[PDB]
């Protein structure tokens, strides 16, 4: 819990920063804004290209795998020996998943999962050690490719978010730390504030590319940041998201030959008379959301019981690889068994399925269970949303829903790049269409009882129940559906689905964040917040640096192995400012003592990795010198009264993205310090 | 009065009458030649003649006959004919010359005739299956080959349809085989599949239990 | 073989042949009776017969003739006929009984005949206008009255069309009047309109200038 | 400039507030959130009903007026005397506009204009005296009805925003001050913070009802507030906007008989192959935006020269009435003259125009100029967006564009309820379709040169150029268009159109706000902001109240006619808190002296209107008593160091919605105070 540091979003307005800004504004021309816009444009373009590459590779590899399996099944249908087809399916799945799990578990364990919790923590202000590294990007892309081609109940949409963030964090700095290659651009943006801004833009671009929902991504980034309103930053995020969508669509169109691919998953067009809701349908929607919540809770609950087990028995990397391989094999076996035992043969329209499988079915017919399991989840969802009333058998749909629910619950925590949006959407769509069929039977084939609309509602309800988002999720669903009206039902089902869920258990992302012991700041303080004050929250006694401090004392306090504090308030005992451990280390490394002059470029060059205390060597004679701190600290630190109410402190801390908050007495007396860990230890 | 407003010009009268005659012939043939489906090989000459006559009109009498009313009966009739032709893929049967049918479709229909000859031959159902297996299998193989050939030649999307006559014959044969005679006998491999699936499903349970017991032992 | 798969049942043969004959007759009549437009009063019996025959089919032979193919030629033909009928509003001409035309449309067409009689009478263009003014004005008034009557009776949206024959006759008359003979002589009131508009446009200038001068004077 | 007070968004965490919150949370059940949700739902419902009423009344009255005028014109076409028709048109226009201008100019001058600048100021924190009064609502509704039926180049969409705000400000308080009727609900929300929250919700609901753009309204409210991110408030605003759209659609549908009316103006469906853009069309779009900017600037520029004239010659109400009547008459005369001189007769499809006018045209034909002038602007815009390539004559379209541009420039500043969104959209659509026709001629009838798409682009460009909004406007246009792709061009044309505009002149709303001498805080401080510090911004000397102050001194300072300060920092000279003039007045009125106990309900009952100083009567003996202020002030006022940078102070002030900011020395010494007027005196 103490290995998770914080992000220095609060820029220090020291004398050197003021001089740098003065010189920059005295150059007769300002290029910082132009560079920011260019960076956002590149972020969007590269995110779109990455999405296109992922889509193309997945399409080709999955097509070949399915073709091989289908050919083997057809060849052995009448001759016999269908078991060999099962062996082949399981073996291919196991091989792909083995490669993916080997690259993730051993080389970069951080790449596991969707990566959305990591970016949520990042925008909250917590740095997880290896979230924005190049190795993480490469590993995540390869792992998502292999897992999707590996036949796992996963998706390739969520990870894009993470990917975008990495790009934003990388090209912004203008250099490659991992590759040790430096290009002479973007030195100004080598700071935490610009990094977080660009990362928010990249996450929005990733959401837009995944779902074709630029405004949804903008809202996602705004919610996660939860900061003071910034007009220009929001404009830039919107710009990046829209460039990402345009790039994805254009590149996919040119690859395919001849503007109909806004995102990776595309639900289709719901502009039809069949898709229309009356007022009398408002209650049923809500009821259905209830179910979502309940089901969602159960899902999450089970995963919790799973995760603990994995944390405490299956933690060795080889065990993780074995678990992933076995899960893939079992998924393939279950799909094959369900297809084999199926008895519902349906005529094929022609092109409805890319790889129609006939097995114990009359000539000219196909097996629906194969359609469910032998197809991509995205177009399965699309079909579930757009099919005629009698296109499904209730028994097969129910079996598929149950089995896929359990499989997706099993698969989320594996040590492989994956996602949980599409599986939840698919489960919701399946049981929503089941509900629609039930209603149509009950209502005597009423026109308003269209199974596809209820499938969409169930998809939204399940997605909300598992991952409990309301606003950005609602906008994402509205944009993907391309209809504004269906928002009003959606907002309701997402509203209730969330509420019911919160009664039983928390969300998936939140739960996994807590299980990592990450200090996460929520939107608001708890109910008892008004009762408490800053006196109990603040930590005492405080270690303060005199405005006139000796090198020996500074070395002694920095080297203290009892704790590692990266921020110290200055004192005369009157507060005068705040200085970070990094600034002191830089000053010591440069031997700035009083007994030729520094610039902020020297501070930025050390970014983002700073040397430890043990590295610096100081002689005995030098330790007798004094350090003039006045000209390097934050002269106007944010401060609150000793008796200020807890909600006020939490509000200021979250909105301003602060790291250290000085709690002061009535005579500008330093009496305490507040960090995110002080605020986060409440529930 | 002016010749064109109150009544028809003498020349356009002939064009309208000819188009009417051709349209009537084509519609009657379509209705008569749709069960079993014979639209292509029966109606292709009439459709060609209708198209030729409308082109004749379009190439003076176009103005007074086509687009001088809220409706254009000529236009909608011809467009309906063209929609029916295109939605049949009936050009598949015909060559680039449009004159006669391609040897591929003739061969398929002739295999269909031979197949039904086999079926009736052995009707007077084990007899029929045992003797017409090879005929049915050749028919199905040819249908699949023509499907693939059409897909690659037209560069069309998978599942694109063929001549409606070919598909109707294919389906009549399929219904005769699978249902009326129920000749299909797919093989059963229940025991191997069940054993393999059961073992593979057992594996994860063993993995987790072994991890639990080993960690407990320490 | 089974009677239905390879070939048609004896009874459905008659239904298909009858529908073919009726469709051919109707299509020929439509093509011939579309210039000048005579679709309604000429083709209504044939359309009624086609509808009756398809209802006869739908009410055993429905299964073997209608929906046992990727296409349904019978269905698409009948639906095309119905689309042409509906998109004509041709029910306007016919009464609820469908038997004969309504007296309103007969009266209009007969006024059209009388009008063209007047036009040809005085052709051998001041003569034609001076003598057929009243006929044309009665025709136009009747057309407007029928428009309003249809709108209120059907409770339809404004601008809804009528029988295509009525509209075609109306338009032929309008073209003969306005263009070929150019009988229309709208009155001109340029001077009053110009004077009134100029004065009204002057007013704001006077208002603003008066405000300016008065404020300056104080 | 000094008559514009500020909104107390910064809630004071005094002892009484803490006790009230403790008691409320100790009731075993909390109803405040439920009441807030209910209030938002009512706000949306009532805004939707108001929009429906406006639409119905406008439809009926305008239909009758147009029918009468058309009948008169047809009757006089051949007989002669067409002048009388012109007289009748002008007289009807003048009568309706006379009634509207009489009700506005004499009874409630605040109701003039769209009301969007007033709400922008309100959400910025400035209170204009009569913005949220019932009289204002009634007058605005009646005036918009009369002006729309009066034949003016105005719209009925913008005012809805204002209307919604009023409703939110009214039902939230639970009582009618104007009617002196009190209902015993919603006493808790009788404060500025909840009022501003509800007003933002109402403005969002109004935008959604006007354009069918809930997310656009949410973004508009967020931009105007420009505060710390609040998740629950944003959820509530989204809820209110969507309820508003649903109510409008449902009520209009039931009125018309048989879900296709999301808003008052509905652009239509752009889902077609004709509406599609290639990459090569990106440059031209941008070019066209340039024009927008330029044209927009000119528009605004001229209006400025107009407004000054009106401010300094035409300021008497009767002169305003005469001006409005003359403008209406001239509009009617110009329309009639243009229709009369038209020579382009077109066949009528049937129902294309509600009232087709034939005048010197062959039988069975209509006049297009009549279509342009003799029709509602909204459906004129819709037709401009959706018509075949050869549906317009360039000369008529150009004449109409020029004349309507000048008329709309003339009409905006009149003393009548009106709007400027729809006229700008119409001008933009007209000249954009002209550009599209020109391109089609130049490009040899190319398929990509569809005039309707370019008309939409021109509408967006002109709207951005006149009123310079980018984000919320972009989302509004995307939702109304119902296509996400066309956003990418739109965002560009709005981006450049704005930029070019800012080179020449500011926006319409901003310009009118400054001309009223309102202190408006922008999103960010100026370029020189970094140079300045809080020392020069703060005002000295400061009038401070001792924690132990006498009644006589307090009366003397409050009664000082030199200036009226509504906030005083407390001093021991060490800062201890801040107390507002209102609190002191309430304390004096209740004779709370030390020589049975008060509650915050007494403070709220005096809301929103507080008695003056002259009203309170204090005897000589009482003035010798002391007031114990400790238990009534803000114990934790927001404070900044004396040397804090100006951008930091402005950022904190804008984000937190503060009214008074204490500038303090290093020993918690009060050295200055900062209010919005200190920050706003820069450019
Ligand atoms: C179609 C494929 C397109 C995908 C684009 C992939 C490129 C994005 C990427 O994957 O990254 C780029 C790397 C930087 O990544 P990097 O590996 O050096 O990571 C360090 C390190 O890992 C720290 O790790 P830390 O957490 O311990 O501090 C971390 O914080 C810190 O942010 C990182 O900079 O190269 C570049 O910049 C590219 C040159 C930019 C100049 C040209 C601008 C025009 C685009
Ligand atoms: C289809 C039509 C529906 C339209 C709804 C119109 C109702 C909204 C409205 O127009 O207003 C309501 C009035 C309050 O307006 P009001 O005239 O008293 O104005 C004062 C005053 O004008 C101050 O003026 P100030 O600026 O000098 O301080 C100002 O600040 C302060 O906010 C205002 O309250 O009655 C009500 O509350 C209704 C009772 C609510 C309880 C039931 C809740 C369920 C809905
Ligand atoms: N200068 C200080 N003097 C005394 N206590 C401190 C000081 N700085 C931090 N603390 C306290 O020590 C504990 C651990 O602090 P830590 O060293 O993690 O600070 P930090 O790493 O700077 O925090 P973060 O990186 O999350 O902003 C916290 O509970 C905090 O309240
Ligand atoms: N307590 C005070 N002592 C000295 N100067 C003050 C005080 N309060 C305000 N001022 C200054 O007096 C000027 C006018 O202040 P004013 O009376 O308008 O304050 P206000 O009405 O409370 O401001 P607002 O209502 O806009 O928040 C401002 O420039 C401000 O800086
Ligand atoms: C189908 O293909 C066969 C090839 O096996 C064609 O056979 C030739 O047909 C022509 C008549 O068109 C004869 O003159 C030739 O002697 C045939 N044999 C060869 C080797 O050319 C057959 O013609 C094709 N069918 C059609 C309708 O063209
Ligand atoms: C149109 O309306 C006239 C009314 O003026 C109908 O006139 C009657 O027609 C019937 C024949 O259907 C005669 O038996 C009556 O003697 C007529 N006069 C009266 C007063 O009823 C006329 O029939 C109508 N046209 C049609 C086709 O029904
Ligand atoms: C078209 O019609 C004319 C008119 O008689 C005829 O001479 C000509 O041969 C026709 N064209 C064809 C291809 O039949
Ligand atoms: C329908 O067809 C049958 C078959 O001959 C015939 O007996 C019957 O009269 C027909 N119905 C009509 C209404 O012509
Ligand atoms: Cl994760
Ligand atoms: Cl996913
Ligand atoms: Cl995910
Ligand atoms: Cl205004
Ligand atoms: Cl408007
Ligand atoms: Cl407006
Ligand atoms: Mg730390
Ligand atoms: Mg004031």
Numbering used by the authors:
A (entry chain C), D (entry chain A): 91 to 348, 352 to 665, 673 to 695, 704 to 791
B (entry chain D), C (entry chain B): 73 to 131, 141 to 205, 217 to 310
Any passages from the paper?
At the periphery of the luminal domain, non-protein densities were resolved extending from seven exposed asparagine residues (93, 128, 163, 184, 194, 263 and 274) on OSTM1. Binding of OSTM1 is accompanied by a bend in helix αB of CLC-7 at Gly149 that results in 9 Å shift of the luminal end of helix αB (measured at Cα of Glu168) toward helix αK. In the CLC-7/OSTM1 complex, the 25-residue linker between helices αK and αL forms two interactions with the luminal domain of OSTM1.
CLC-7 is a member of the CLC family of chloride (Cl-) channels and chloride (Cl-)/proton (H+) transporters and is expressed in the lysosome and the resorption lacuna of osteoclasts.
